[PDB]
């Protein structure tokens, strides 16, 4: 059994949603899945597997940050995951984005050290699996939920990024910051699995707190519905 | 008038194809465009403008490498370009890719110094405009032309890359090597225009020569046709 | 209230132990603390506050990786933490360090991106607060528990480091690898608080699994006792 | 036959001038050579070969940027080029440099990604062949043409360099900015050939337009004269 | 016999003090040691061996800069040196440090190229031998001499560092700047010898001259006494 | 009076030879100068001033490494030095270089941290003053001493370079390795003074000892003579 996600190959489905927060993982399992069963809780990395419209789907907590997420993704692939979609939150890099809005990550600027270590410092363009990406975009459109399609930035130091630095990045196409996408995308290609990422804007860089829980939760629900429908398309 | 592409307002259409080879530009204008006109020849950067199915389309030579391509794009934008699609060739980094095959660039690993200079050395994920990327993908399908969707690597030292290095990169998702995409994608976001890139494998890294004129020409013909259809879609 | 550690200053003591695993945090509170109470469980970052020999001591989960630990440490300082000591595990960089052995971290090689982001890429020498370092060392002696004193390396890509690479680093003084120390030390100096780290070897890097429970548990129990005694010293 | 510069050993002399602009390559081949024969026009890399004072001299277009230049230089060496002297223009980084003034490049600051790729990110000091350098310098003095001897900087992002940055570099000895010398010098040492570079200032960084064609044209004339004389002496 | 420090094994004691100034070396030998004997003067790298409380002790000049100190350290280790303690001067990074104040280096920010070359650019945390570091701290306390315990930064360009930069580093824990510690600490681990460093503040970054010779001399005296007592402890 | 080279403006002449070894500075002063006088011995940086063919000439010790040499050069400039020529030794990087062979440095690969700091990490091509370089070359020819003209590499870690790396650098034009040139050349441009460097091969990278005393000694004499003649020319 893997060191951190202490499960067994038969526990994980080929399709997996990857929320960073264990509380959201549980909410997803109980709100959307049939016969959900928790296969892991070691290190608080709550992982669940159930059925969504007749198809097996797992929901695995990644923790915060690319180091934590890389560990989970690497072990997930070992356990049999083949399609992995991150469902997280992000901080808007501009007033253009409003809390609750969705972002289908077209690519992720690698401002983290996990992708850097794997790459031995070489340049790279972290992108999701093209099929998964397309399906996430399609579903978001179909459902009609307010969304954007473009770049996010995966960072390591959450409290280091200033509003001024955020504005600067937005000028280069960055819509928001988050802390996991880049490594997921990289590992997708390295391990030969399909990955994708959709995010719900929970606030704007510089803000001392997150948007109203009402706002946030509706955004999360939309995001998860899009991802669940998308993973069944691939 | 710009320094390198010496044209004036009205010469360049909103939609532009960007072949690196001036020979190809001429062949594209004379083969697909009605009443093509050459607005520039300065520094061999041949630029033509004509009609494709009633819509104005320009074909501008970029030259080889991102420094050259960057100059041409910066000036094209100043002249009125708003949708720029690179139509070029690339070297397969793997063995699964066959010469003549098409590649819709989902992103470009920035291995060039041009993007690095604009970014001041910071990490980045060069990606095309999502709608353009999508339109190219869709069109490739509608025409039924065999294609691949994914990463290419934009490099500076054509003769430095070794088959061994190419193979290593392929294990990271790089489908092939070319020398222009990264800077085009970056500028697209920096200047607020829509960019894209479609390539035609013309060889495998390590080969002393390109592929047979015909096998390669059919690829180039299909690539240009997909790009024309796609630019009219946005 | 902080974004991730949703608590109030009055809930957190000045002396805090920082385990990476929420399971160990819970085990520490129940095993060593008097009247322990869980003040946070948001995101699975279990945090408890109780009493050790009459002195208030908090045990806060950091999660894995410097990005996660940095978030927790930043919010703790905001909550009133003044003395923070990491109590975790590490993989031995050479065949001579046996599982269960304790390591008082004299320093932490910054192989992570979190410190890199905060430092804007500049060189640095992550070190604990001298007095805390000294107390940890002294207590280990007072308790008569076999221990090593030296450098550890804080990494981001757990699964990228090969046993050969680990050993190469051992030649430079690295006793073992972990994923949090560097950021804790840096923030200690940046925020003006006292920090330290003590580790229990859980495996010799390269092992498919961790050491047998009893061997590792005794070491973990010893590490914790040294830490608790040490924070009361400052 | 070279991929880009389609020619064969026999078409190229041992002594070669290297203008970036194909238009200048033609002017030179016609204005100073006797019986000039164009051996290549592929990709607009107009290449000629004739006789200067009874000696065979090739004039080969490199294109703009070290990526393009590196490809042309690498192939010329394969065709048998032994002495390659670049004859280009540059943008003054100083205010004491007037358009038309010549510059015998003593070295080239490598701000380009091409040299960086060949060097694998290692530091270097791009310099011409010592003999060629002295020849150009000596000829310039003999012909009494106003000139400077010093450093230039080879850049990638033409439109990224600001007057402010250019002034800063000037204080470190940089006389002007160009886009090809560094790679040429590096390849000269790598491939064991003699290289050199002389430049005619066409403007000052910040200027939207170049200097009067009249003043500028004379500079090119003098420059070419110096270069031609020099290549024969080695 | 080594290239620079031309002594033979038998001239050098296991315990050694390392002043950068040969003038201080001579002064230390004649002031504190019994029967001082000079074993080397080649290249002005004056080295002496005598007795301190019946224990053999050497005083070896390192010269200024890590390149020079690295050469001397390398050769001393080759000659059998086992405990090496630097006794130098440093420039206060903040106005919090008064001239003549002693600093027990807990670590040293590697802003030098010597450590960079040895580490091939990799990150690192240069730290003293833990036992030596502790002995220095202990002795400072016993002798009753005021002192600070913390980080210093080892730089290469004495005249490049500005007051603003100095105050920026002070925010990250840097107490003062010096020019040899980082390399000593690194070689300490690489060559398996025990190292340490104690410094006397001789000025503030930005000061045209050093502090009062009388105040400085007293600081140097105390420093040397501490080092001597310390090396006898290991 | 400067901090390290404690001299008065009237002590140093406009023309200065910069040996790294103090013993060589003295030999030079006594062997070639009329009425030589030592104006400084502080920190072992022995400096002399005398007359060479009726022209004042100073001989200043720089110590080993760019950090030490930078301090000396910075101070010599502040004292009025106008022409500074380094006269040192170097380690041959290839096999075609015999011991005692002279090298007139055309440029210096900056593998050092001193130049790196002054340049804030930016690329650069350290080169001597054109006229000085020219003079040294011409004089070596005049005196008819066998010489080489080309690149040397200035390094920080004398004992880090291996024969393998040395051979690798030779393929890039690096004739030999030394430890001062790069910083001298950079400061030359920065401070507005004329600098140069001529070297005598004392060994081959990897040799345990230097070349035979007389083989090298003859080279050093020829070297000093070339430098003296050259400085009087500028
Ligand atoms: Cl399944
Ligand atoms: Cl139009
Ligand atoms: Cl408390
Ligand atoms: Cl010929
Ligand atoms: Cl001894
Ligand atoms: Cl004088």
PDB file of N, CA, C and O and ligand atoms in Angstrom, chain C residues 13-15 56, ligand 3:
ATOM      1  N   UNK C  13      -1.754  28.865  22.220  1.00  0.00           N
ATOM      2  CA  UNK C  13      -0.719  29.184  23.196  1.00  0.00           C
ATOM      3  C   UNK C  13       0.481  29.793  22.486  1.00  0.00           C
ATOM      4  O   UNK C  13       0.539  29.807  21.263  1.00  0.00           O
ATOM      5  N   UNK C  14       1.439  30.296  23.251  1.00  0.00           N
ATOM      6  CA  UNK C  14       2.628  30.890  22.655  1.00  0.00           C
ATOM      7  C   UNK C  14       3.590  29.814  22.183  1.00  0.00           C
ATOM      8  O   UNK C  14       4.346  30.015  21.227  1.00  0.00           O
ATOM      9  N   UNK C  15       3.555  28.672  22.862  1.00  0.00           N
ATOM     10  CA  UNK C  15       4.414  27.543  22.530  1.00  0.00           C
ATOM     11  C   UNK C  15       3.583  26.557  21.725  1.00  0.00           C
ATOM     12  O   UNK C  15       2.543  26.081  22.193  1.00  0.00           O
ATOM     13  N   UNK C  56       0.815  26.190  29.003  1.00  0.00           N
ATOM     14  CA  UNK C  56      -0.007  25.955  27.812  1.00  0.00           C
ATOM     15  C   UNK C  56       0.833  25.628  26.578  1.00  0.00           C
ATOM     16  O   UNK C  56       1.840  26.279  26.301  1.00  0.00           O
TER      17      UNK C  56
HETATM   18 CL1  LIG G   3       0.504  30.762  26.518  1.00  0.00          CL
END
